[PDB]
Design a protein around this ligand. Structure first.
Ligand SMILES: O=P(O)(O)OC[C@H]1O[C@H](O[C@H]2O[C@H](CO)[C@@H](O)[C@H](O)[C@H]2O)[C@H](O)[C@@H](O)[C@@H]1O
Ligand SMILES: O=P(O)(O)OC[C@H]1O[C@H](O[C@H]2O[C@H](CO)[C@@H](O)[C@H](O)[C@H]2O)[C@H](O)[C@@H](O)[C@@H]1O
Lengths: 255, 255
């Protein structure tokens, strides 16, 4: 009888995900739904378990933070009462980010500032959005502006950024684009230690931690706050029959 | 029919709370319970709502992160299937930290290192544990060792640490004890800006973010990881009838 929605994040300690969750919560409370959280840790098996538990407890709707391994078949019992965040699936409502647009905007900014030797610190191509799309957008920009690409794809963790930044720092390098704020935080620790002050850093996130600690890093906002509001509203709209599933892309903005 | 436990944190973006949650999750999965999270944001009214929703959905047990405003009367329908974390209540199972012990250990280390002018950056006395107990432990140490106390109690936020650190720095000040890692992170940003390198910082938390960014800060571990394991085990023990409610205090440890 109580209206309940579930939010399935991949990581409870992810700042990027928490920023989207922060705007979902007031929108759900205003709609009369009490929100509950669950964590997947990128496991499709754990997601399949959560979904069954939620179904048997008659939960009204689900906001699922998508990742590689989620199949349409495991989302079958939730077609009309589920919204995917960060990934899309045919016949499902989704709220996605503009990864290519985020990288092109950042690369243009660095290029207009005079930077020609810009290195990249990213995540492996198995991670479709943060990894593949972001890295390929960097490559497409380098190709179009006859720049020499220098990249390393260690992964998501701050410590991975710290351990692999030296690999992409060359004598001619003046700027470093990090696929995530977390990676920029790790890379920044190494540069501070080695007393490298000459490098302009750039990252995707615009998280409050990044803004506070490194005001000098150029950041691009993927729109986590907006994504959260949209996902909550799309979910309530379809569970109340006011809307059919839509696929929304949040535009990236600079500063 | 599915076994479910709820974890009610105050803030989803609190690193200190997430460290306790991190060790609760594997212990619940091993016991056969699927964990769900809710957020209170220090509102007793919101807690009263969550508890009712959980009761009507027949949730097996609750781990509640305590704060000022929670009464025994609102916990009445959960006496045997609830564990409090960070605060105690008569007749309730609880897992608490040693706030006084954490401050005494840190002050002794700073004192043994030769520091005599130690300033304090804390949180107001209305926050019983982080605020009152931590600040009073600092005062008791200063009294016992004939030291001059210099303190400011702005609150929990990183920005509050940054804005109020200047107030407690005197020309004789050699060390600064921060009630939380978050406060030390904020104070550290100000000191970096003002090019103050002479100060020895100390904080309570030993969070991975602090350890990675500031290896030079002296930290005390309140035992969030241990607290999480204990709370999960005390909860499953009482819901299965293996145990009666206990009040556990986790010892603080240095490094
Ligand atoms: O370091 P954090 O703050 O966690 O940011 C990293 C990254 O996090 C998210 O991407 C990851 O999770 C999503 C699901 O939420 C997956 O679909 C991706 O494959 C993961 O990479 C954000 O979407 C990213 O913008 C952010 O940079
Ligand atoms: O800045 P964070 O990492 O959140 O640490 C601050 C502080 O957080 C917790 O205290 C607060 O929440 C508890 C309930 O979880 C309340 O009982 C306190 O009154 C609040 O101050 C931790 O218990 C503290 O150790 C930590 O420093």
């Amino acid at each position: 009888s109580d209206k309940v929605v579930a939010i399935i994040v991949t990581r409870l300690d992810s700042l990027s995900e928490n920023l989207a969750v922060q705007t979902m919560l007031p929108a759900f409370y205003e709609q009369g739904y009490d929100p509950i959280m669950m964590e997947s840790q990128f496991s499709p098996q754990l997601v399949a378990e959560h979904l069954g538990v939620l179904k048997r407890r008659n939960i009204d709707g689900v906001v699922l933070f998508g990742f590689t391994g989620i199949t349409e078949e495991m989302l079958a019992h939730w077609q009309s009462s589920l919204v995917l965040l960060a990934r899309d699936a045919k016949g499902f409502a989704s709220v996605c980010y503009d990864d290519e647009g985020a990288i092109k905007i950042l690369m243009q900014r660095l290029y207009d500032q005079g930077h020609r030797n810009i290195s990249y610190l990213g995540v492996p191509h198995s991670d479709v959005t943060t990894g593949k799309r972001r890295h390929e957008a960097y490559l497409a920009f380098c190709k179009a502006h006859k720049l020499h690409p220098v990249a390393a794809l260690p992964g998501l963790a701050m410590k991975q950024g710290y351990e692999n930044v030296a690999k992409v720092i060359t004598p001619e390098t003046t700027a470093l684009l990090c696929a995530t704020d977390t990676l920029a935080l790790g890379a920044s620790k190494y540069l501070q230690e080695q007393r490298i002050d000459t490098l302009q850093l750039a990252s995707v996130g615009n998280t409050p931690l990044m803004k506070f600690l490194h005001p000098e890093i150029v950041t691009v906002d993927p729109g986590y706050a907006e994504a959260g509001r949209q996902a909550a509203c799309q979910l309530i709209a379809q569970v109340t029959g006011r809307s059919e599933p839509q696929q929304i892309i949040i535009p990236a903005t600079l500063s």
